[PDB]
């Protein structure tokens, strides 16, 4: 940390700091000093130095370092007391790194954070400005009724065009289209009789019931008689696909020769295209005037200390675990005892916590279904009280399932709004009296572990993908093949759930969380309709446990991020 | 014969433990039943390469038509045992994990409920080809060995003792166990206490409680005392604990000694809120055949609860026998085992009898146990706007006609409206994606015709079914809750109510209000003494109608002179029964919720002036009727009787208003109250009172000119114009309604309005006057809030000029070049959420406050 001070701290004042305030940093470096920031600086110089603050060169060097650090961030032309607190904490981290550099011998909790779908910063693409632009959150602005769950009426219009121009950028950046053909907007096609064209289009079924491709300039009807699709992919309505074929002006139809998805791009390619924007906000937060920049040396240092920390493990349970079943309770007790042998870093708990959906019943004599949910969480807290190591050393993350209390109150266990909110805090307070650090997050959960961005998602993807797949007239282990098809489709979209709004709705204000234009290094799709798998593709890791029980066995994972390795372990129940 | 007591779930796939009786001996036999599913394929070809011990056949039955699929394949019926079903469940090369799968109908059916449906309460075996019955005894019985039997012989009489066990949870945190022995002479009570300092010993008081209820229930036990119990005079035993861990072991010993007392020939009446946790904690009850009743949580005070709880214990002990005999009478007709049917939930017998007739008529069930959604082939849990629209929208369109009425306004109560609607579906109608399957509704219509015909023979079971079908349809807890079915019944109920309005209008009677129960109409007569025979002729003429022949229409109240705003704001003069009296035993009813949005000094003056208005209106109507008999109504010119005192009273009240509004001594009478419906802000309380009085006087369609001149003269003293912005009236209560909230006691399905109703009539039933628990009210407000939020998020966008729906899903603007606006307003949802926040802050729904807290964050 800091150098050791021999004498005791004293409480020096903003008086007699007056010559040692404006000359040293406000004239040499040009930063205006407010009263509260000057008081905080006087307090911290007092605690660092003591009685030798009048004749100490360390005060002058520390103020020069303060002005220099405020010059790299440029968080403001003024000096704020909260800003002094952030700069002081970053300096404590900075000289901790420098002390580790002096003698080769930080903390992981200083940089690890959890971001829900509501807490994520908003970004939107503009090809009239040709790049990204950040939108400040409106949750603080206005009334909480207006801010919470009431998005603007234009955002439904803007959502799929934003996804379109993101997909257009990701396909224009690829070497294949900087070569083969070029993309023409759909509105230009009508009039060009019998000429070959290549398109990017939102695939849709129109009011007539035929297949169509749509762009912000319009739409055209297509027919899929002559298609030769690319093997290894999934095609569902709502896909934005590359379509090559010939338009005919007789019946206003487009005859498709071949169809494919746009090719993916790696994570570092996306970050160098955007210019290393800190999208999650690992260093401060992005404001309106200044956008937060991820430092390259900071990223290298976090990668180095990530490779230094090798004992950290991520234990992932299988999803769809029912708290009301006694066999699941016994199996959870055994596997939590096995985790009580050695506590991990994070224990991400997920799945549909109750077997039945929680609905407004008409049995007033019996305990209600929400009361059953509360009693099940109290029994879970009673089991967690038996194990001190997990509640002392391991933080836990709670991901909602499709059948939890909060989202499926009106959906009744069905598909609902895609950004499913976390489990209510009033229904689980005893868990907060047991665990030292527990985070109840949304269904798309973006956790930042050092230099790693991890996305957690719980959805039955493969059943919906297989049910609404595009059937054609003209058209190797099976589980592995379908696994590669699912992961390649999801990463080539750059979206968690690329379905239409009729298939699965998305709340309008928070779609950027579900938009996966920055491809994460490792995400965990949790699909009980698919088998367990682990693959890497395009610089991304996609892992999947499926259901919690599979033929009298409880399945869990130990994922180390340092060597990027996952061990699949099953427990015979 | 083999009459069956209990079908019992077991840990083995496809194996269930069955308790029957032979010669009064309770026999336990393991039973093996394969599961039958229905499979929808992409093509007509069957790939069946080698599947071990499975029957695959073609099936000719149509499917439940969910709107997203309404191709070139065929339905197939497949029967296979559940264990080997699990053997090809794990194989991905099997047909169950095929990629040519369209749907898997009835894949979640348990062997237990399948044995309930298929085999009935009366089963017989076949011995035309059987090597050894004992080999069938330990090796189990298959369904090809069995068939149905006679229903009347099932439980004609049993010489078998009951074992009666209850768990009591109290509001103060106490826990009670009680054990009864009919063969013994002991009633045993285990009591938990938090500390030994708390005192609950009442052995002599329990004896006095028994002596109090002895003469009280001697006349009630004796109806069934010759069958259910031998000696009602038994002795009391008690034991006390300060903990719960050894209490399970004590209960285990005291229930294990029953097994050596009788020897596996008795059933247990178990009443505990927790069942699965109970059977996890104690073991010998799980093998024991159990009849079950879920028990309401006992709510008791801190002190003097002890005689109340001992009274309750003696009441259940002495009232068990009539419940047991009612189980026998229910099981005689229902053809369901006595242990497996739930008496407490009447929808189970409805579901199984319905599904029996569905399986008789060769049509695939949507029987789903552990979810309110149907099966629909397993392609459920996918969002569609069709099912969200037909499952979300629960709204009953009331027909409201405000005004003053001098005819004899009739109140008729409509009973069995849903039953008469769904029973006469073939007369109301005299490829659709949102339509229920027609043949299943013909099945239900014929079944309800059979139930109604059996109800006229005073079958109380069938009476309970025909009174419980309307609650079965609305309930998602039932196995066959289909949203298309409920929407079909709700739309037909709307059609039947509108046809009832048209039929009452075809007899020269205009309605005032229409609802599910209460209907207020306006006749052509002026006095009820001339209107009684005409009302009887009208109600018998509408009972003559073929579309309405099962409708229980009963007159509730005669209204002579009525003012109508809605059901929550009405005043006038009424009589319950017609009598030969000069005064006719008339009474005055004033039920203004408008009065509550006023200052407390100004509240009784509103009722005073309403009484003056009513008395002047009766006097004017009587004078006009006597003068004329010997478009405007009889009420013209009534305000000449009392405008002269009212102007002076308003001026005196104005003089009192300009003195004491700002004085801090009298300001407490001048405050505005905060109510959950209130959204407006008052500026002058006397202005609001004058507006309310002139608006209730302004409801008259005939003398609106004279009332307008009176309002013009009254608004001059406040120095306001005739048509000012603040002078016009708005309703000070924003309508918050929850649709179709029914009590479990009298099954009255009503819509509860949380803003415009009194707090006394909200938490309890309207007719039964039995208090609802607040938890399900909170749950229904959560459901209504998320329904409104979901209706905001799934939303068509319309043009500002063309008013055309958005066909191309993503575009800048319409070809008419208008902007896209929501079908729902931007401010409507936030006013709904603000009224939800206000009603949560008023009525103290802490779960709803927490929901707003997590919604804002
Ligand atoms: Zn009631
Ligand atoms: Zn237009």
UniProtKB/Swiss-Prot annotation, chain A:
Keyword Nucleotide-binding in annotation: no
Annotated disulfide bonds: none
PTM annotation, UniProt: Phosphorylated in a cell cycle dependent manner during late G1 phase. Phosphorylation may facilitate the interaction with POL2 or the activity of DNA polymerase II. Phosphorylation is independent of DNA replication but dependent upon CDC28 in vivo.
Signal peptide start-end: none
One of the GO BP terms on file: error-prone translesion synthesis
Main location: cytoplasm
GO-annotated cellular components: cytoplasm; epsilon DNA polymerase complex; nuclear replication fork; nucleus
Keywords assigned by UniProt, alphabetized: Cell cycle, Cytoplasm, DNA replication, DNA-binding, Nucleus, Phosphoprotein
Entry GO MF terms: DNA binding
Sites bearing Phosphoserine, chain numbering: 497
Source organism, top-level taxon: Eukaryota
Localization annotation: Cytoplasm; Nucleus
Entry annotated with the keyword DNA-binding: yes
Record-linked InterPro entries: DNA_pol_a/d/e_bsu, POLE2
Chain's role: As accessory component of the DNA polymerase epsilon complex participates in chromosomal DNA replication. It is required during synthesis of the leading and lagging DNA strands at the replication fork and binds at/or near replication origins and moves along DNA with the replication fork. It has 3'-5' proofreading exonuclease activity that correct errors arising during DNA replication. It is also involved in DNA synthesis during DNA repair.
Further remarks about this protein from its record: Present with 3110 +/- 251 molecules/cell in log phase SD medium.
Quaternary organization: DNA polymerase epsilon is a heterotetramer consisting of POL2, DPB2, DPB3 and DPB4.
Family indicated by similarity: Belongs to the DNA polymerase epsilon subunit B family.
Name of the featured protein: DNA polymerase epsilon subunit B
Organism (species): Saccharomyces cerevisiae (strain ATCC 204508 / S288c)
Curated annotation (Swiss-Prot), chain B:
Start and end residues, zinc fingers (CysA-type): 743-768
Binding annotation for [4Fe-4S] cluster: 799, 802, 814, 816
Motif mapping: CysB motif: 799-816
Positions that bind Zn(2+): 743, 746, 765, 768
UniProt-annotated location(s): Nucleus
Domain notes per entry: The DNA polymerase activity domain resides in the N-terminal half of the protein, while the C-terminus is necessary for complexing subunits B and C.
Misc: In eukaryotes there are five DNA polymerases: alpha, beta, gamma, delta, and epsilon which are responsible for different reactions of DNA synthesis.
Function: Catalytic component of the DNA polymerase epsilon complex which participates in chromosomal DNA replication. Required during synthesis of the leading DNA strands at the replication fork, binds at/or near replication origins and moves along DNA with the replication fork. Has 3'-5' proofreading exonuclease activity that corrects errors arising during DNA replication.
Family according to the record: Belongs to the DNA polymerase type-B family.
Binding partners and assembly: DNA polymerase epsilon is a heterotetramer consisting of POL2, DPB2, DPB3 and DPB4.
This protein's name: DNA polymerase epsilon catalytic subunit A
Organism for this UniProt entry: Saccharomyces cerevisiae (strain ATCC 204508 / S288c) (Baker's yeast)
